[PDB]
Structure formats: C-alpha cells, structure tokens
Amino acid sequence: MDCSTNISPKQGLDKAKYFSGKWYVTHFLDKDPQVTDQYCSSFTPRESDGTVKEALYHYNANKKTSFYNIGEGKLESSGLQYTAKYKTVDKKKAVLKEADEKNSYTLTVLEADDSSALVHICLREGSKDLGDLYTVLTHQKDAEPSAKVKSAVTQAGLQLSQFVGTKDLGCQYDDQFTSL
Ligand code: HEM
Ligand SMILES: [C-]#N
User: What is the position in ligand 2's atom list of the atom closest to the CA of 58?
Assistant: First the structure.
C-alpha cells in the first residue's frame, strides 16, 4: 500500500513547538494494516543543526508487549519533515540492531502548537512502502487535542472520528524510556 501523496510540512511552523516535551499518540489513522493488532505510541523528538534524534516507543495493546527504537535523520529544506533511519533497542537503550540503509520512515509535521500536533509517517523498507499513518499527538497521556489540531485533521481531508482513539486501548507507556 502506497503512502499518501499530498504530504508536505506546514510552512510557518515554529520548530520549538514540535521539538518540545514528549508526544503521546491520542488518535491514529492507518491506511492498510498488515497487522490487526492495535498499538499505542509515545516519542521524544529533539533537533540540533538540522539533525533529528528521537526515542520511539510502541505498545501492542492486544499482546501487551512493548518495543523500542531510536530514529535519526536530517530535516528537509522543505521545513518540518525528515527521513529517519532507526536503531532497534531494548528498554535500556542497548542497541540490538544499528540503523541501516534500507529501513526508514519519513515524518512530516502538518500542525503543531503548544499542546498538540498532527503528523504523518510513511514507513518504508527498500523499494516498498510498508505503512502510512496519521497521528494526533498531545503532550500528556489522554489530553484533549487542540481545536487547531482538529481543524488540521479536517484540512488534511480526513475525519477524526475514523481514527482509532488510543484511550480505549488500555495503553501502557514507559515514561522512563522516553525521558531525555
Ligand atoms: C499509535 C501510533 C502507531 C501505530 C498504530 C503504529 C503501528 C505500527 C506497527 C503495526 C508496526 C509494525 C510492528 C511489527 O509487526 O513489527 C510499526 C512499526 C514501526 N513504527 Fe509505528 N506505529 C505508531 C506510531 C509510530 C510513530 C509515531 C513512529 C515514528 C516517529 C513510528 C515508527 C515506526 C517504526 C520505525 C517501526 C518499525 C519498527 C521495526 O521494524 O522494528 N510508529 N508501527
Ligand atoms: C508506524 N508506522
């Protein structure tokens, strides 16, 4: 399944609002799961001189297992958009696999304000797009997304009610891992 084509970062976005705190996914819209399991996610993005580093957590709400990654990529000349290669780590950040050259994701920020954000993620391996995801983000677990971000969903051509809301999933987070 092809990642979504009309995706570009919102211009005028202040990078300090996006590379701020930690993010929790409150809603996600996944185009074509080759998996039926539903996930929760939290991550902590930081940027310096155009390089983005982010600690990334996923919790499988069906199996009740968690996995961990560290992404690294460069900002585009376009604005708040980056393609990241990623390490696979354990909960203590010990590296299981280094980043490689075939596995990457491209994250594009479509809205970000003081409390909330809307991003798009296209996950790829080699010549294949593996996932396309929109995620609504907030800075605390189950905080309400802002009006601005709900408007950005509607402006992306989407319906917020068609996203999966993560509150109902019994999410568990590892706030230790996403600290720093
Ligand atoms: C609630 C939000 C999310 C959902 C529902 C979701 C869903 C998934 C699923 C189903 C997988 C495949 C797991 C497997 O079977 O190996 C996956 C992997 C992955 N996701 Fe997400 N994801 C979420 C958030 C994010 C975010 C925010 C990012 C990036 C900042 C991200 C980046 C990745 C990466 C890099 C992998 C590959 C991990 C690997 O190959 O081991 N995901 N995600
Ligand atoms: C995750 N995509």
Answer: 1
